RNA sequence: UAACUCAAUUUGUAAAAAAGUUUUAGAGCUAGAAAUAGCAAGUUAAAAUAAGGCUAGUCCGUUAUCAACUUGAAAAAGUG
DNA sequence: AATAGCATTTTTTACAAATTGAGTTAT
DNA sequence: AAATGCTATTG
């Protein structure tokens, strides 16, 4: 017979249903596989399949990038070891040999245990010396004595293997804040007498260097400077040393836009064009501004002054040990004093974030600055140690998180020191001084990637050589511009168009002429003489172009119609039709070039325009300047200096979607003109790219079809990994379906798709850029943000009368939406709008009136710059003074409402409709067997809650199976009462008011009560019955009360870390695991906590007693994921080994995770691990007892029906009970239920429903979890057993779970 | 459906950083047969950071994909 | 069996691709 | 961001 396929796709469920002409989903009875007394069984066509959600490749990303990372940090090291090889040998036999070995135990070290010295006295008079190697490393800068080579390779290998960050480009040095805020008040003095600006120099160091943020501490700074704009010359000199990239246009009144990053590696080019611009007069302005940004920087990394000590960082290390030294010998006389009896725990118990747990326990710094806190300020004579707990700068250590501050050049200006120093003493350090440097300073570029051999998945780069590569020999061994390119051109898009082509650079030339030549075809224009608007003049296009469009970036139409009409073609009044504002495709790159290159010869006569594409391509290839410099040599023999040096000045941006073939050069015989030459001139056609191709009396769009892998195809779907899931599981459930109806394609298909921490960094980098006075009155909750009431306000300022909205008048005051619920169903937030009231905004019947947007829209542009909210926003919040929400925009908004637009769907549906539908017809044509029908996501939900089915998820995993039916009803009649739709909802080929009130009473054919809708509603055309509200609506009613729907989890061998993370101390267990072959986790402690990939059944033997008699045994032997490449290696060798003899090689059952077993009255298990289950029962709570649930728990007609029917607890709790007793098994726990129920009846009738929902974790399927009874916790019932398993019946369901092998474990 | 303009999320990749943790090294001192007392100290470093693998690279090693049965190296097909 | 503690973090630079949602043009 | 299988301790 006839039938259809409704699905609901989700992150983590497909439901899938089978309906039939009635709206009637069939059972059928399939064979059963395996060895047990069932031979047969009976499901219904409906049912869902459960599964993990599918993750992404970040974490993995992550690891893997920070894995390459260590094994580079450790060749760092090796570098630096193989320099000092044949020296350190005449030093020390095996210095390096003892360092290698640091982490053995003394018992398996083959050298002295002492690294540095080889015995007791050197190594401790090593450390009395030079306590810290900070020490060691400033005095190796300052003293000018001979070192030995140990303590030389020791002060490098600390500064090469942790070298600080590359984030800063040029070479800063310690040079270095008043006494450089006062050169750069000099310099713009002695600049500007007649303006001139002064503040003498006394509070320098710390309105700049306060507890405070950087942005508000030039708000402390700048506004403290009477009579300049911060926003101006001086506050921009000062914008710099904080850390900007300031723009100087109006400053110096320059036309190009001139934009100087201090840190970025283009700033020295990008400061001759400013001086050349401006004269070289001004060069002492930022050749002052980079001294106090210097200082800036510096001021927070060291405490030190650099005119004693050459290591100032080292030095300022040194300086946080005394201060670290002498705080801690206060500290102590300051307990013996006053409370010598808490002496244990602050210095002596590990346990308590004390001082003691801060060294030698676990206590970070904000710990234990959280716990001696209250002991300062209660013992006097502690008033500098508060400060500096209040500061931040109480006990410090030297390797600390905030040490990410520290850049490279300040560990290389020591490293270079120490190099320079001992070179007059040793021969090798002079000559390897570029060498040992050049491991400090050398950094693969990210558009390299992984220096490979044709071994590596994820590199890319180019081999000149196929030699070894070293940080010395780089740019030898690798071709970095091929690299550079190929870095790009295996991420950027082909020409759809042409698929072996490739896309050109978003500022190609020839491209961006297409861009207008496309847009201006189209406008027409009309005059006082003209009856009719006449199209644009093919033969005169090349005129509006050289006139308006080559003469500006962007062409007015307002600055077309007044410079054209009224000089060119002796034109009054000008009226376009076309377009009325600026023009969206500008000639940019031609007024971008004909300001750089200054010939308008060259550029516009385009004789050769190949060379100038190249120059426009390196533009958008590469953004570092070193590339760009060779790249662009080919035609410096052109251009001067001026000419081809302020080319590496442009750097341009973005791809094209369309190739140069299509665009020029793939051409007609017939027509004998390209795309780009016809949009020129279509005589009285003006045709479009678009028409371009699909007239059929051109042959473009043959010559494009004529010249153009499941996972593929949903792989390069554009959509979260985690949905991507949800659709490859969809097509399978699909595909076997379809084999259930004995291989008979459906008549059609309905698929449906569902929808603290980052506020805390979000919030707190605002709260530093904001300067709110949030903390007065605002104390923390790291997860508290979630509160929307509070969100909403925060983001002390409230919406409608721009005031402030109270904390209990935050609660009161009311939250709209920014375009009413009845236009766009979106989350509160990103249109979460709250006014003192609703009578704010205006008419909730459109969007909020102009008079508001007239009345604040001037600080709506105060917030968009603050980048509150999205622009996005600001469209539709200013669309009531840009236009407003009107009869055609509410038309549009109520049919996308429930018309599936989003893309993931539509392929989706693209996918499934092309494996249906691969059968053609006489002329070519496609055959449509099969009706693909995407449907939104509120229709059902409307439909249940309209006509009696509502759904309470929490009963059991019905829901997802429930909507895929639903789905499939509403999904065949919607497109039956509205055949005109199948190119609406189907995949394939005052009246604005009125298209509204067809969208909006599209659903209203199921009811039979608006204001008397007939019983059976018909098709519009045929006379097919296609709703009869008598027998349908109890069909309906009829299959959500089944109780047997096919629910089945995904198998799944797990996969991912061997094991938690945690690398724990040494202790007794075979439960620890070693890190390293020989690093016996006795001694060298390990992991713990292996995750198992899959179990095995093992039948076997084992030795027992000192006899080694064989027992037999049946057991589940968790293979881990570390183990399993081994055990598949070679099952019964790696069994073996484990103990097991004689192991039953056919007998080895893979049981992967969540494998299900059925044991006694329906009792059903899903093996989590090799010895913890997980409940597999599903409970069918009666349909009658779900909508009370949901009403209970909740227009006033069906409220009686709560009063009444009422008491369908006392039935629930039975079922429940009944269920809990026969599968559940959690005899305390259900006693706890019971008996927490019958003292909470006196409770209102909402509360007694609220906490049944509560009870369902219980009975859920799946991992027992804790939950609430009113104010009763139910710590979770665990499984934590598998023998049980081991004699019950393994079930091996299909997709579906139709078709079943049963396996009853009963073997031995 | 396509190009176009503007501004948000999601996905994928590469290059870097700072910590954390683990063992060792940094002679603890007296008094006591010992348990235990008193006191002195404490900030640093080396090395490891998936076990590892062969393709031996300054590469690869945590994503995706997985009922059963028969057939396939696999992909996949066939089976009610 | 009931019971309880446990889980590696954080930061920067560079690029590409779709999507979504406000506009002009056309098939 | 929880959520849930390890780990160990208990009478």
Redesign the pocket.
Known sequence: KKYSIGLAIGTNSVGWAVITDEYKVPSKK?????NTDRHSIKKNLIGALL?????????????????????????????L?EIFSNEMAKVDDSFFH?????????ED?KHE????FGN??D??????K???????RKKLVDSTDKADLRLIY?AL??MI???????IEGDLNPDNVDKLFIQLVQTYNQLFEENPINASGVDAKAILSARLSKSRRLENLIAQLPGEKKNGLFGNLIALSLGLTPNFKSNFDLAEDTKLQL??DTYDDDLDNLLAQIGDQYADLFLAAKNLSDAILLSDILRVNTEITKAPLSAS?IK???????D??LL??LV?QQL?EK?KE???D?SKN???????????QEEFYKFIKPILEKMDGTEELLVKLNREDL??????????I?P?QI?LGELHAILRRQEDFYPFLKDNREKIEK?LT???????????????????MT?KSE?????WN?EK?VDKGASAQS??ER???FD??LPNEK?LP?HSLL?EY??VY??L????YVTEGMRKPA?LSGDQKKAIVDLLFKTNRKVTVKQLKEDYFKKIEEFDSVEI??????????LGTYHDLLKIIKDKDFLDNEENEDILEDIVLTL?LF?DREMIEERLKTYAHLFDDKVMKQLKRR?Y??????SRKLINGIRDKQSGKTILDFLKSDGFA??????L???DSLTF?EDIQKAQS??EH??N??????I??G???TV?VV?ELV??MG?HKPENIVIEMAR????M?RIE?GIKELGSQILKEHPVEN?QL?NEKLYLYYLGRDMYVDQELDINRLSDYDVDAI?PQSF?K?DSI?NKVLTRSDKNRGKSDNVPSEEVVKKMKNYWRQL?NA?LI???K???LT?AE??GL?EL?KA??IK?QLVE???????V??ILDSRMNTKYDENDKLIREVKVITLKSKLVSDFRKDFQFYKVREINNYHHAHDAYLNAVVGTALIKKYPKLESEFV?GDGKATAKYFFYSNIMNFFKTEITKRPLIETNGETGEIVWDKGRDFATVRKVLSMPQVNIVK??????????????????????????????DPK??????????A?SVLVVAKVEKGKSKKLKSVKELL?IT??????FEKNPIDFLEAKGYKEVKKDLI??L??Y?LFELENGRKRML???????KGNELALPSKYVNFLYLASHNEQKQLFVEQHKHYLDEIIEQISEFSKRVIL???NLDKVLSAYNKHRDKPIREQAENIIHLFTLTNL?????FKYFDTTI???????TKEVLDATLI????TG????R?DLSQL
């Not at 039709?577 to 500008?586: I, L, M, P, Q, Y």
């Open positions: 399939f064979k059963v596989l395996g599964f993990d959600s599918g993750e992404t490749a970040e974490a993995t990303r992550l690891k893997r990038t920070a894995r390459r990372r260590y094994t580079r940090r450790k060749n760092r090291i090796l570098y070891q003892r360092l290698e070995e640091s982490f053995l135990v003394e070290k245990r002492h690294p540095i007791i006295v190594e401790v008079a090593y450390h009395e030079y306590p810290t190697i900070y020490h060691l020791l290998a600390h293997k942790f070298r600080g960050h590359f984030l840190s970025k290390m946080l040990y005394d201060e670290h030294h002498q801690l010998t102590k006389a013996r010598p002496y602050i210095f002596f590990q004390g001082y003691a747990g801060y060294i030698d326990g676990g206590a970070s006990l410090r250590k030297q390797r600390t998180f905030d040490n990410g520290i490279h560990h491991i050398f950094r693969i570029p990210y558009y390299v990637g992984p220096l490979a051999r044709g071994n590596s998945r994820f590199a890319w081999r030699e070894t590569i070293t940080p780089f061994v870095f790009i991420m950027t898009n759809k168009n896309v978003k491209y297409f861009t496309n847009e075809t189209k406008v027409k199209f039709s076309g377009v009325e504002d600026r023009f969206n495709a500008s958008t953004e750097r941006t973005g791809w094209g979607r369309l003006n045709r479009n790219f678009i028409q191709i699909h007239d769009k499941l996972h949903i792989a779907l554009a959509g979260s990994p985690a991507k899931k659709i490859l599981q399978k595909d084999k259930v291989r603290s921490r980052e506020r960094k980098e997860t979630q375009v766009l979106d990103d968009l980048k999205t622009q996005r600001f469209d539709n669309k840009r236009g009107s925009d549009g908004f996308r637009t989003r893309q993931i769907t539509k392929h549906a693209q995949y995904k198998t799944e061998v797990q996969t991912g870390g061997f094991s938690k993370e945690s690398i724990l101390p040494k202790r007794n267990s075979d439960k620890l695991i070693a890190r390293k072959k020989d690093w001694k060298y402690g390990g992991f713990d906590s292996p995750t198992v899959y968790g994921i570390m183990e399993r490449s081994s059952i893979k992967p995770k494998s989590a691990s090799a010895g913890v289950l997980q959690a005899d305390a799946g991992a027992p979890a804790a710590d979770r019932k665990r499984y934590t057993s091996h369901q299909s997709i139709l078709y079943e092998t396996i």
